[PDB]
Amino acid sequence: DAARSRRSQETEVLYQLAHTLPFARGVSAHLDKASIMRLTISYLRMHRLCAAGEWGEPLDACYLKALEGFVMVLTAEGDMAYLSENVSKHLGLSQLELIGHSIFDFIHPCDQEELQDALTLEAPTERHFSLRMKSTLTSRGRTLNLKAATWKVLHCSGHMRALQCLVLICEAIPHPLEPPLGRGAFLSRHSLDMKFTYCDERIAEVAGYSPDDLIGCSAYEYIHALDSDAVSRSIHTLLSKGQAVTGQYRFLARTGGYLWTQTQATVVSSESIICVHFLISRVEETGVVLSLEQTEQHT
Amino acid sequence: ERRRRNKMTAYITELSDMVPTPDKLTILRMAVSHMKSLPSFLTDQELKHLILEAADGFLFIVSCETGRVVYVSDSVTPVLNQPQSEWFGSTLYDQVHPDDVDKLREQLSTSENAMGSRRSFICRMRCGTSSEPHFVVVHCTGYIKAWPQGSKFCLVAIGRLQVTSSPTDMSNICQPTEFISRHNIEGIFTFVDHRCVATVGYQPQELLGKNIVEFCHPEDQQLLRDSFQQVVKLKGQVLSVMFRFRSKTREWLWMRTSSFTFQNPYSDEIEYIICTNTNV
């Protein structure tokens, strides 16, 4: 009867500790003891990490509001040290269920090697990589229980900082319309070999192409050779993960020159690719012919 | 459930090492009072610093109607090499590339999308310049907020550099040493960059449509052919060859061409051969 008494008081002080957690009132009523322990331990670890920073304002809350992705800091062992609340908006899983667990239990298997090489033309500590994370979201909300969770491609960018942490902002690649359209972008559709099957009419204003002439042509013929490798890698990602974001690259205009571009590509359903290209520049070197088609059109 | 009791042991030991100031429930008691020694998981200030540790960016707030800068954070100085002197008192259009003004104005329009609506765009902004301004690509994400005339709408945004990998000649800072070309499998020039003009004396259009063999010394032509056939039978691995190239003027030049086939990432068909042609 003394063993019980002690265990009952253990559960009581553990529930009191759950009441000390930095969450709204009543949330602790939905937690189990293991989750209480995990969240308290991770809270103390994150406080130790934030205390090591060498530095109250009402404009602070703007920062997470201005971001589109979510905050994630991972330890050197791969455990999710911290996630911001808006993670629920991107993966369905909340920070309550994810803080204190290992990232590898929520990453696609074939991405674990990439992440492991990230946790150990680019500044030495800066990190850019795509990661498939478990998400329970559909267009109707959080409708998937964890075992039918789908893979969501996240463009992760951040820094190795110093224990050593990897601090990332992780952003979702939106899935791709009707006039009137905006400026600084156009849309294209390709087969999996990246041959044009459709292209926005705005291309005529952007690069001077009529969309009908692009139909059937390989997209790789329209990139600057200097951007060869990078675009290749992007497409490889697009082919293995389902979505990708390219770097800045030069797209060749019809009669000469090029313009700076960055595109988001998504595989859709037998399968095809949709590209949303955001323009960075207007046509540069307009009087310079670079490709054979460019000099065939300059005449 | 033997696992369940054993993870709870480990946890109590982790919290043991976490609380600075025993038996498990004594651990829990002192951890309760320690937690009460210190509602969100992190403070807004902490999260701000975390975000600034992740992104190379700065927060700005500008009026939607005129672009007038109403706030910029001090991290604009390390990011853009720009004093806050340059932003406060100006408009965002003063900072961006002229070619971006229209786009900016459209992003700042709240006609169809207003309070709480999101914005995401790319522009080029002025950085610190010693002697003609120099622009850098900035990715901006933010939201529309009524700013307390009446309460005018404002864009509250973060602008970041280096969201992806950055996108040449690097051994001679003055005159180009090489140029890149592309060829069909037949060897015809289908792409050349303008450095050709400085390296071999030809305008790009003087090479496009012609075969690379047409510029190779006859005594070296068979060697060049062999090397190209070999690179076609390899799949992406680079192979080098050295041969005498005929200049538009100024005689024969020793030239190192290192080539590899571009494989379609899906169909694995040859898109073209890529060549780096370097004057030896």
Author numbering:
A (entry chain B): 19 to 73, 80 to 144, 154 to 195, 214 to 227, 230 to 322, 329 to 358
B (entry chain A): 98 to 118, 126 to 142, 156 to 229, 255 to 273, 300 to 316, 331 to 349, 352 to 464
Paper's wording?
Hypoxia-inducible factors (HIFs) are α/β heterodimeric transcription factors modulating cellular responses to the low oxygen condition. Hypoxia-inducible factors (HIFs) belong to the basic helix-loop-helix PER-ARNT-SIM (bHLH-PAS) family of transcription factors, which sense physiological changes or environmental stimuli and respond by modulating target gene expression. There are three HIF-α isoforms in mammals (HIF-1α, HIF-2α, and HIF-3α), each encoded by a different gene. Through crystallographic analysis of HIF-3 α/β heterodimer in both apo and OEA-bound forms, hydrogen-deuterium exchange mass spectrometry (HDX-MS), molecular dynamics (MD) simulations, and biochemical and cell-based assays, we unveil the molecular mechanism of OEA entry and binding to the PAS-B pocket of HIF-3α, and show that it leads to enhanced heterodimer stability and functional modulation of HIF-3.
Interestingly, the potential role of HIF-3α as a lipid sensor was suggested mainly based on the crystal structure of its PAS-B domain in complex with bacterial lipids, which remained bound within the cavity during protein expression, purification and crystallization. Here, we began by examining the overall heterodimeric structure of HIF-3α-ARNT complex, consisting of the N-terminal segments (including the bHLH, PAS-A and PAS-B domains as shown in Fig. 1a) from both proteins. To fully visualize the ligand-binding potential of HIF-3α, we crystallized the multi-domain mouse HIF-3α-ARNT complex and solved its structure at 2.3 Å resolution. Each asymmetric unit of the crystal contained a single heterodimer. Meanwhile as shown in the superimposition of these two structures, the N-terminal α helix in the bHLH domain of HIF-3α is slightly longer and rotated about 10° relative to that of HIF-2α. However, it remains unclear if this distinction is real or artificial, as it may have risen only due to the differences in their respective crystal packings that impact this region. In our study, protein production of the multi-domain HIF-3α-ARNT heterodimer in E. coli only yielded an apo form with no discernible ligand present in the PAS-B domain of HIF-3α or elsewhere in the complex. As calculated by Fpocket program, we didn’t find a sizeable pocket in the HIF-3α PAS-A domain, but observed an empty cavity of about 280 Å3 within the PAS-B domain, comparable in size to the corresponding HIF-2α pocket. This vacancy provided us with a clear opportunity to screen small-molecule libraries to identify unique molecules capable of binding to HIF-3α selectively.
